[model samples]
Target chain A: NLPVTVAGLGPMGSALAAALLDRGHDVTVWNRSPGKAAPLVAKGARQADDIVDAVSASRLLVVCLADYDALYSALGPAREALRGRVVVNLNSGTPKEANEALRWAERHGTGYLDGAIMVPPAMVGHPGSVFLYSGSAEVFEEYKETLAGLGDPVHLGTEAGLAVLYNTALLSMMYSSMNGFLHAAALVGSAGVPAAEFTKLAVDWFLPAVIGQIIKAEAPTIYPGDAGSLEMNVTTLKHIIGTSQEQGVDTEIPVRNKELLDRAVAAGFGESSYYSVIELWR
Target chain B: DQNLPVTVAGLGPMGSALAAALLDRGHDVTVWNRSPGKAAPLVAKGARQADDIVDAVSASRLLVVCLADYDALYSALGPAREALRGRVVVNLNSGTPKEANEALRWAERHGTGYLDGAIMVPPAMVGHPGSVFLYSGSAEVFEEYKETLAGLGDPVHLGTEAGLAVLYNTALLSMMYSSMNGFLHAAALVGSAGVPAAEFTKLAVDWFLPAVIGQIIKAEAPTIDYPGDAGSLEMNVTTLKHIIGTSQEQGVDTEIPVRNKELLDRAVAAGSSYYSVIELWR
Candidate 1:
C-alpha cells in the first residue's frame, strides 16, 4: 500500500484520511491539535508528530483547511521536506489564491494541484461525488487510483484556477438554490404548510426538471420571448412580493428580482424572457 | 375515466383548458361564463354549455371555479350562492390566505364543500402528468375529488387549512424568484471571465445542482433550528464577496451579485447546513 499524509484534522480532512485508510492505503495524519488525529490512528492510520514528519511520510499530501492563511502556515515550515511531493488542496478559495499557491509550490520544488471537494464529509465516499482538481495532469493521471478512494476525480486543465473557477461558480449556484428552498419553506410555513410539503414540488421536481431544463434549452446571448415574456414574469413577481409581505415573510429578495425585471423592461427587453436578464450583466 | 358530470365556471384561458382536459378524459362537462360565446369552442367539442352559472352548478356535483381573483368569484357566485349547496366547488382563484378563509366562511354558510386551489401552469401545459395543481381545505374532499383533478394534472394536497394552497403557490413562486435571479447573476459572474453561458450552464445544470440540491430535495440536508454546520452564510459570504469583486474585476455589472451578497450578509446577520438560511426567511 502506498503512503499518504493528511494535514489539518478538520471534518473534511478527517474524512479524507479515513477514506484512504479504508482503501488499504497507509495513512499518516497531522493536526495542530494532536487529539484530533486520535480517531484516525485508531482506524489503522499513522499520526505524524510534526508537519515535517507529515511531509516526510508520503509523496502525496492532501491538505484541507479553513483558508489559505492556515494552509500556508501549516506547510511553510516543511517546504524543504515537501520537495518531490504533490500537495492537493481541498480547501475553498478563488482563482487568485490558486495562482498564488501555484507560484509558492514552484519555488518550494513540490508538485502542486489546487482542488475542491464538492460534497461535505458525510458524502466523502459515496458514489459519483465530485472531486475537482486543477494543475499538473501528470501528477493527477499518476495518482488517479489512490484519489478514487475519496470520490470520482474530475481533472480540469493545467491552469491552477479552473477548478476554483468552476467550483465557486457552481457552489454559488447551489447557495442560490438552497436559499430559494429555505425562503420558500418559510413562506409556506407562515401559512401553516410544512417545509417538506413545499419542498417536494419545488426541490424534487421544479428546480432540476423545470428550471434546469429551461436554462438547458435556452441559455443564450440574445433572448426571445415568444413563449413567455418579461411582462408575464413581472406580474408573477408582483404577486410573490405581495404574498410575502401579507404573510409577514421577507420580501426583499423578490423586490430586487422584480426591480431587475423592471429595469430589464426599462432597458427595452420588456418583450424578452429573463434569458434577457443576462444582458444587463453584460 | 368515468363519465362523471363536472361543471366549469369562468371560461378564461385556464378554465377553457380545464374543461377540455375533462372532455379529453371522457367526462360529461358543462361550462358557463358571464360572456356567452366563450363556451362555443367547448360546446362544439360536445360539452353542454350551461345557460347561466346556476345551471352549470346544478348540472354537476363537482363545480370547478377558475376566475380572475376572489373578487370575480364573489361576483359570479353572488346570485347562485345557494346553488353551490351539496356540490364540491374547487376555487382556483389567485389571492391571499385571508381571501381564501373568507371564501371558506361563505361556503360553510351555504353548505358547500369548498377546496381552495391554484393552477400553477399555463393554459397550454394543463392535462400533463407534471402539470401542478395545488389544493388544500378539507382532506376528505380533496382525497375524494382528486380523481376529477387528475384529468387536468397532479393534484398536490397541502393540508386541511383553507388557505394553504394559496400560500404554497406564492411560496413556491418565491423559490422561483430566488433561483432564477441566482442563475442570472451566476451567468454574469462566469461571463466576466470570457466564458460563454452555453459552456457554464451545462455544468451548472448537469453536474453541479443534481449533486448539491438533491441533498436538499430529499431530507439529506441538516435539520436544525439555527445551526449551519455544512452550509453556512459565514463561509458563503467569503465567496460571495469574491463574486462581487470578481464581477467588478471583469468589468461586468455587479448588482446581481452585490444584491445577493447583501442578502447573505444579513443572513450572516443570521451557519453550515443550507437549511439554516430558513431562519433568515422566517
Candidate 2:
C-alpha cells in the first residue's frame, strides 16, 4: 500500500527511502542483499522481497544504483511489471546510458525519468540538495511531489540524458576547483603557510573576487575584450610553473596550463582575453 | 619633498597605478618609463616624471621596479646601475624564483637593499585593502618600506629567500586559472541544455566556495595520515570519467576534464589512492 518504491539500498538509495518515510509517505524498498533493507524496514518502510514485488508495490518507483549496468540488471527482470508505472532512475552514468535506459522503459510501456543526484547521501531530503531530472514533462508533473521527498527536483528538459549531462558537467567543475585548492595549499605550504590558513584566504577572498570576472567572461563578446589577455596569462603561467619547480612540488598542473597558453599565444591570440583559451579546448 | 618620496620604474598599468596610489597617500612620487607617454597620466596627478633612468633611481631611496619582466628591469636600470648603491630597490617584476634569486645577487653586487615582490592584483585594484603584494628578501628592507608599500596594497613579507614572493604568486595564479577553466567548462555544459551561464554561475559560486573551504580544512587535519574518509581518490577518478564521458556524448569540449581524469588515473595507478587528493600535488 506504499505510495513509493525505492529500489536499491546503498547509502543514497537508503537515504532516498528514509527521506520518503520521514515525510509521512508510505515507502517500499528493495535491494539485492535483503539484509540492507533492515534499517528502512525498522523505520516503518515496507520491505519488498524481490524486484517484481518492489515494482508491483507502487505506481512511482525511484532507482538509485552504482551505475547504469546495475540499474539494468535490477530492473531488467521486472520490466513486465513496470507497465503504466513511472520509473525515475537516479543513477550516475554516461549520457548514452541514460538514453538507452529511457528507451528500454519506453519498450516496456513505462513512464521514464532519468535523474542525477547532486548531493551526498547525508544531504538527501535537505533543501540544498539538488536532484536533476530529464524526460517527459508530463511524467515529471505527475510525481513532482513524491520526487521532492529526496531533494529539490529540477526538471532539466525533455531529453532523457540532459540531467546526467548537467550532473557530469557540474561535477567536472567541482573537481577542478578542488584540485586548484590542493595546488594552492601545497604552494603556500612550501613557504611555511598552514594549509588551514591558506584555505581560508582562498575560499573567502581570492575565489569570490573572481566570480564577477567569470560572469563577465561568460559572454562571447568578452572573450577577447576586458579580461586579461592570453599574453598576460602565459606570462603568469611561466611564473607559476617556475615557482612550483623551485618549491620542489608538482609542476604538472601549471605546465599543462602553460602548454595551453603557449599554444594560444602562438596562434596570435597573445593580445586576446584569457578566456580565449577556452577555444583551445574546442 | 618633506614627505618621503618613492620611485616607480615603468609606467605600465600596474606601475602607473602604484605611482598614483603613492601620490594619493601624500608621498612624493617620481616615475620613469622607456616609453614616456605612459607617464602622462601620473604626471597629471602630481607625480614627477623623471627624464632619465638615473634621475628616477635618485628621486627616492625606495625604488619600486614594475617593469614587464626581469629583462626589462635589467635594461631600464643598466644605464643607472651605479645609482642603485645605497638605495632600496624593490623589484616587482614577474619572474621565476631562480630569476628572483639571480636578481638578488645583482642587487647585492651593487650594494642595493633588495626585495623581490609580486603584485597579486590587477592595476585597477592597486589601492584596495584586499589587494595583496608579496615580498621576500632582506628583512630590514621590508620593515623600512612596509608603510610605503601599504599605500599600494596589503604587504606580505614572506622570508629572506628573495624568491618566495614569485613562488607564491605563481601558485595563486595556478589556482585562479584552474578554477576559471572549470567554470568555463561548466558554463558550456549547462549552456548546451539552455541554462544561461549567468544563472548557473551564481549557484556554482555559492556551492563551490563553502564546499571547497570545508573540504580543505578537513584535509588539513585528516584522521588518518592521508585519504582518511574524505572520499577515495578512486571514486574521484571514476567521477571524472563520467564527466569526460558525458562531455563527449553531449558535444561539449572534453580537454579540461580529460586532463584531470588523466592525472587522477596516474595517481590511482601509482597506488597514490591511499593518500589524500592533496598528496597528488606534492
Candidate 3:
C-alpha cells in the first residue's frame, strides 16, 4: 500500500525494510553484494537489480550501511535516477560529514535528509527507540508519515547535519562508558571478584548515580558560558587521580578532568556549575 | 566476642555514618569528635560520647579513628597512647599507602594492633547490604573485627600489607572518576543536538550501555592477563588513542582521555601487557 525503497541491504538496511513490510508497506531493497538482499526478498520486498532501479522504485529512499562511504558510492553512480525523491541517509558519521552528504544529495536533484540510527536492528520498530534526522523542513514534513515506520524517527533541526552530530557525540559517550566499565573491572578483578559481580555495581548502580549527576550538571553549561563548581569537586578528583596512581594504573583521564577543572577554577569559574566545562572546549 | 566494643573517633560525615550503623545493631558504641558538639547525633542514638580523647578509646577493644588527618589523630592520641594499649586501632580516614604503613609502624611502638581502611560507599549507604569496605593489616586483627565491620560494608580484606587497603581505594577512585568525566563530556556532545537529557540518559543506561559495552567488560575481566586478553591493554590503548586523537583534530580538549590512553601505552610498553593491570605491583 505504502511505498519505500531501501539501499544497502546489510543487516541494518534489511531491518529498516522489514519494519516497513511488517507495517504492510510495499518495500523495495537493493545491495551491492546482490545476494545479500535475499533475506528481504523472502520477506516479500522487491529486490532491485541495481542502484538505479532501487531509486526509481519509490519517492522515499532509506540508505543504511557500514558507513557514509558505502552509501554514497552506490547511489552516487545513479545520480540521474534520484531526482524528485526524498533521500534519507541513515548512515553513521559526524555532524560536519552529515552536512556534506546533504550538499552532495542536493546536486543530484534528491531532497536530502540526514539521519543517525541510535538503536540496533532488533530495536527497529520500538516506540521509544529513535532514529534522528535533520534536514529540510519541507522534506521532513512531506515524508514524516512514511518515516514513522522506524519507531520515533526524530527530526533534530533544519540544519541537515544535526542528526550526525548527535550520532557521533553519543557514540563517543558510549565509548567513555565502555572505558569506565573496563577500568572498573580491572581494578576489582585484582581482588579476585569476577567481572560478573563487578558489572552489577558499575552498570546497575554507578552508571545511574554518577552519570546522572554529570548530565544534570553538564548540559546547561554547554549553552551558557559558566564553568564547573570544581572547588567542591576538586577534592574528589584528587582522590580519583591519587587512587589510580597508587594502583599503578593509568591516571590520565581523571587527571585530565582535574586539569580542565584547575583551568576553570583559575579563570574564576570555580563556583560555576559543572556544565561550565564546555567553555574550555569552545 | 564477635561483637567487639568499639569507639569511633572523629565525627565527619563518614565517621558519623559508621557510628550510627554500629549503634543501630545494638553494639556498645563510643564516639569522640574534636569539635565536641559533632557527636550529638551519635549520643542521641544510644552512643556514649567520650569526655576526653583517651577516655573515648579507653572503653573499647577496637578503636576506629576517622580524624581529619594522621597528624590530628597522632597529636590527639599522643598523650592517650596509655589508653590504647591492648586495643586495635583501625584508621579509616583517607591517606596514602606509604603513610598508612608508616602509621602502622608508629602504632607498633604503642602496643596497638593497627589497620587502615577505606569506605567506598557514601555515608547514606553505611549499614546497607550493598555497601563495601576495604582494609589491609594483620589478618588476625581484621578477623577480630570482621563481623563488627559488616555494619559499614561487605568487608574486602586485602591482606596484612597495611597499605593495600589504601592502594585499592585510590585505584578504584581513579577508575570511578575517569569513567565519570568521559560520561559527562559525551553527554554534553549529544545534548547539543535535540535529544532530551532524560531520553538520552535512558537510552544510554539501558540499551547501548547494557547490550554492548557493559556486557563486554563483565565477560572480559578475569581474562585480562592473557595476551590479547579478550580486551588487551594494548588493543584498548590503540582504540582509545585513535578516538582521543580524532576528537582532538575535531577541536575537542580530550586531555583527560588522551592521558588515559597514554598511561595504557606506557603500561603496554613496560611489559605489563602479559599480566593484568594488578600485576603492576609485581
Give per-residue lDDT, candidate 2, residue A203: 60
Instruction: Give the lowest summed-lDDT range of ten residues in model 3 chain B.
Output: B222-231
Global Cα lDDT for candidate 1: 0.77
- Residues A1-282 of candidate 1 have per-residue lDDT tens digits of 889999988888988888888889999999987689889999999887789998999999999887778888999999699888998888746777888888888888988888878777866866756798889999899888888889899887788877777776666566666666676777877866655545666766767766676666446532111225788778877877878888998887678778888988888766776678778877
Candidate 2 lDDT at B117 equals 90
lDDT tens digits, residues B1-282, model 2? 336888999888888888888888998889999985798888899999899999989988989898888888888898888988999889988578889988898888998999999877777778876677889998988888888788788898878988888776776678777877777787777776677666566556665445433343345433312122235677777788788877876678898898887777777766733235557777
Evaluated with TM-score, which candidate comes out highest? Answer: 2
- lDDT tens per residue, model 3, B116-230: 9987666777788667788889999988788888777888887788877776665555555555556555555555454466666655545555544444444444532211122
Per-residue alpha-carbon lDDT of candidate 1 for residues B151-252, written as tens digits (9 for 90 to 100): 787888878988888887777776766676677667777766666778678777777766666554354333312011344556567767866655565676
TM-score of each: 0.84, 0.85, 0.70
iRMSD computed for candidate 1: 3.9
Q: After aligning candidate 1 to the native by TM-score, how far in Å is the CA of A198 from where it should be?
A: 4.6
Fraction of native contacts under 8 Å reproduced by each candidate: 0.48, 0.44, 0.26
